[model samples]
Target: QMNVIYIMSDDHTSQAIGAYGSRLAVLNPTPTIDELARDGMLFENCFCTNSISTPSRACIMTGQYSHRNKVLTLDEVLQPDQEYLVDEFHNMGYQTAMIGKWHLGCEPSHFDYYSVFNGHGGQGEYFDPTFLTSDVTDKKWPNNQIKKMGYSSDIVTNLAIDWLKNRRDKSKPFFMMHHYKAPNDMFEYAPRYEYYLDDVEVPVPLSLFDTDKWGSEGTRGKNDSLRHFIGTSVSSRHEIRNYVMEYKCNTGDEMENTYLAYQHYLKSYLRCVKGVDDNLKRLFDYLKKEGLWENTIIVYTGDQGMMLGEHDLQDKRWMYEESQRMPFIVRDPRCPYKGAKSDLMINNIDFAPTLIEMVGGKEPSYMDGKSFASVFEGKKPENWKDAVYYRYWMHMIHHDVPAHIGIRTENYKLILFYGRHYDDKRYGQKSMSWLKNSHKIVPTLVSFELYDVKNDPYEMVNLADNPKYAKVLKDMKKKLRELRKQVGDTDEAYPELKKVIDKALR
Candidate 1:
């Protein structure tokens, strides 16, 4: 029997790892992560259904989309009454434990053991986070100290290690979900990675380097346009200018301000990553020491990818490549292929079925994702999908983004925005205050954007208006319809979206 150790980091990008060929030279080198990739299979094109924390975790846990799971937005709590992957493992007689960041709603249950963060929608503070234990007990640490210890990344890992060492079933094969809150924004690092700032300039993305193709045309969708407008404001609470390229600091010119901000951001991000890397090393060493390294299946991934100045944006919640693309690496000795790379299109929904299949179990009938165990063996499945769908429903909750849906194939992307307000009109005067204080007025999006990924991998060009690509547009639209039908999304709302997109493209 093989033990499963699934390690997940928060808001991480594949670009930060050296094995992925990222340009950042001083990224606190993760040799252990690279070694895992070398020994296992590295996925080059994995994505997330939604880019935010809670929704993304919900999608993975249920193996379903945000809309289907009913956790469409970050603020929406996950209904624990629904079935999940943990139940499957528990029923199969495997001992299961989940430690660190449980953003999927409800105090952790349906497992043998669990410890999770409490309050602030899972975006808890860096220091002194409140923890909920498995016995339905809550504890505040540091003896009257509200501050979190060390760094969140290191603390979470240490807790996992302690759990594994003292507690955990050694006789029966185990399933452990070790989640880490590192490399996330409000970036905080450990002391070991403190000098990361003095080493290199954070590499700038290609899309951010130039700005001519799209030139701000195309559909601004209700969510994105509002977010863009709100972020552009100097006084709005959701201001982008404060973190983007312009803003006054205590000391520095515009260039200095921008450069320093990026550096400061990079330092915090890398510091957290360094702690994760160290934990990876520790976990691997434990597997070896316990004589279980060869028989265990180790999977490394993140809930969602984060944006670091890509397209001049500071956060996730958009359909942009930086936010949608996630890192996936699998290490299993039973697989035929070793140290191989596959570009098979995959996502969070695939997690449940894939893990079940890895341990010689059948997948449940309600799962929306297909098992890619064949792809890991270096063989492509005949019935694999050519495109993947994505959606974001929480608009103006935290950021002023519009809810939208879209599809991505190997080399093409199409997004449709549905403008809606975060706050209802009935919330009275103070609720409507955001409307007068910001530049966005309409709640829904008024446009559509299409891209040819081969020519614009960075999504800098908007081809929705180009008459030359009418055939391409038609083909993609057909694919989207077929996919929607297959996914059982027969809602009448899609037709209106189609009509809007068709009129704009024509």
Candidate 2:
């Protein structure tokens, strides 16, 4: 009769959580979650299979990668036929509920209770967001839409508490997912957390010794072309700078301006994290008061990681650590885990299986991930493999963040940035009309980025071009191939990437 409280937030990374020993620790952003890490374990190498919000969430729900689930990019909608984690829990006689941001494009089912944000399109509003619910059924959307009254994190927390008290079946042990939309983009915080870190200095990426200023705004920046960094004036209200970045350069004092922008963005982002941290205290207190603390298996994580101006980038899409890794903390009062930390290379793909295993269910044959529930037992398994496959399929789509696939071991990471936006024209599904005229036969613009992750944790150097690391590069490529095999991916489905894979391997 164990219960599960799988609390997750959008774009909440290790950088925001004090428990993960963040650079932003001076601001004391996440204290309640830090306590969760103290009680349980803080995963040092937890990553996402795909870093985009929709694909990552799909991977979590299905325990499969984007290739298998077909939710490859943001535009693709989730089909109802996929095997979901909640469905497994519901079948095991647990009351399953989901409160807050559900970004999977369709009305969520299989949960006994669910209230998801209406028309988020991946970014739900921070205040007065509308929610679609399971309580009332309607064919047309804005169906059963509940227009929330306060800040999103606080409102979502209150709903979860209310559901636990009055809505859920007390006889059945429950599995509730409390997902929040805070600390995402256009970073909005509650009124209380509006000026949370005003006095504190925002943490800059401490390991950025390789760059002159923020990063090399030279060849790499010019070739990546569409990045919104250079020459763009940032407006806090419009978080994304989508216009020209090559002209009107903020030169001479560019270094000073870049640092100022980083601080400005960090201030707003940290405030949202603080809001979530503040609400977590409320929820944890409720569980203790209700005598449910000891019996519940609580897992706290994020949908995906966000880049806090790491590598001169804002949003997530790259295979970089900031974009790929998330904060994963778990605590069960019944368990023996206390302040344990692991670098086990666990990923979002492992999430469904872990929860399934925690609830005493065997993982299905189709799941591309293994259960690591025993990882909470304070020791790494002897046979634990320490590498994971990663892929971001959107390509140079929205943010101009090139499509990539990679392998991240405990100490090394090799990435193939086969720079091209995903062409659904290959499948003739999503992008055919757009591809007909706009597509050009650009040369294979391949950039194989490799990093010695232990020595270069912030990835300030690209060891791929170094002649001395030839043997290392070969080994990593071989490893990358094997990892792709492990996840049933060889060449990408697109012809351009597939052709490149065939040539690049030799």
Candidate 3:
């Protein structure tokens, strides 16, 4: 059996990766990650079913969509008894281990052993992090966690290396998850990476200044004309929170202030990414030294994508490209394909089944996804999916983004921002005070946005109403409906939501 190490980081977008060739590629923020892509297969179109932390990671863990897994938002937790991706592996005698950033709000019980972040809402601090180990307790979300010194990325790597070298049953193959908490919000990095991008002028995304043109009448809402109810901005457009104010960039002019904040945001984000890449080298070197590199299957990706100032947005949860696209790279030494790029459409939902197939197990019936393991062998199956489904259910949460759902194919993208809050009592009561302070209970406005992604790669213009592409819009809507039903995410129970969506489609 081949040992597998799945490395996942938080909020590391494809745009930030040097291999993905965004504007920031010149900075080479992730050289080690680039090498992984160079020596392995890089997936060009791996997306997340949901863009939030808890839900996205849950999809990866259970191979199910947010609706199927009942982890629609951060408010919900993955129950310990939930059928998980690692179950079959454990039964197959692979010594399973989990480490770092267990944000699912429960104990990592399925695994043989685990060490996960236990404080700060499970998004642990970058420095002097705390962890909940299996030795401590098996209870759900215990209060007392052990604090450890040094950066979180380094600490997480240390734990994984320790498991591989000493703690695991050396007789059996291992399935270890080495997750990192870096490159998330606050974007802190190790002291060694402080000067990594100090002298460089970080390239800014063009849409960082185009908030007015990004969305349409649908996002403006009924009462809010300024559309201040939309995404948290790098500029001053967002009334409540923005990177400009957060970074204390008093440039006076809106454009200048946005520019300064983008610099700070991108620099800090890239620094944390650099820390992750550097630590990845440590993990890889250890594997090579132990002569386990050739037999081990390593997969690297993020929990979900980040905005990185795209569309003037600071955080994720939008169905936009940067936020929706998860950077997925796989390195399998036995595979013949090397330095290849696959444009196959996949999502986090398929992660578990694919890994299970790679590890010689049948796909579980409960998983909403199927394996694309053939892609690793330099073969694309004829029955591969044409499009992937996406949804964001946390309406008007921290980022001010309205709950939305959409479908994405290779050539086009569609979104329906059914501007209705979900579970208001639960979400509202649990929301931060800043969001509740200015948020209003407004009338739901159903709106649609379609983009010819092939031509408009940045999604600069919405083509939902264009007479030239009416046929394209109709076809996409039909496909979205079919996909919704296939994924078992239909709004059948909520007749009111169904009516709103039906009217929008019409």
TM-score of every candidate? 0.87, 0.89, 0.96
Backbone clash count, each prediction separately: 15, 1, 0
Report the Cα lDDT for candidate 2.
0.74
Best-fitting candidate, scored by TM-score: 3
Question: How do the residues 371-442 of candidate 2 rate in per-residue lDDT, one tens digit apiece?
Answer: 887776555555767888888877544454556788998888888866555564533222223433222222
**Is candidate 2 or 3 superior in TM-score?**
3
| C-alpha lDDT of residue 370 in model 3 | 87
In order, candidate lDDTs are 0.69, 0.74, 0.84
lDDT leaderboard ranking: 3, 2, 1
Give the local distance difference test score of model 3. Answer: 0.84
Model 3 lDDT per residue over 1-506, tens place: 88999999999999989999999999888989999989999999999889999999899889988888889988799988774787878877798999998899987878888889977888888888888887666455475467899888999999999888889888899998888988899887788877888888998777887644456667765445746766688888787788887888886687899899998889888888998999999999999999998999999999888888888887788889999999999998878888899999999999899888888887778888889998887788658898999989887766767778899999999998887665645343423455446555443467888988899889888888789989999999998888888887777766666777777766
- Highest-scoring model, lDDT: 3
Q: What's the lDDT for residue 381 in model 2?
A: 53
List model 1 lDDT by residue over 228-275, tens digit each: 443222122234344533334435354455556665666667777777
On TM-score, the stronger of 1 and 3 is 3
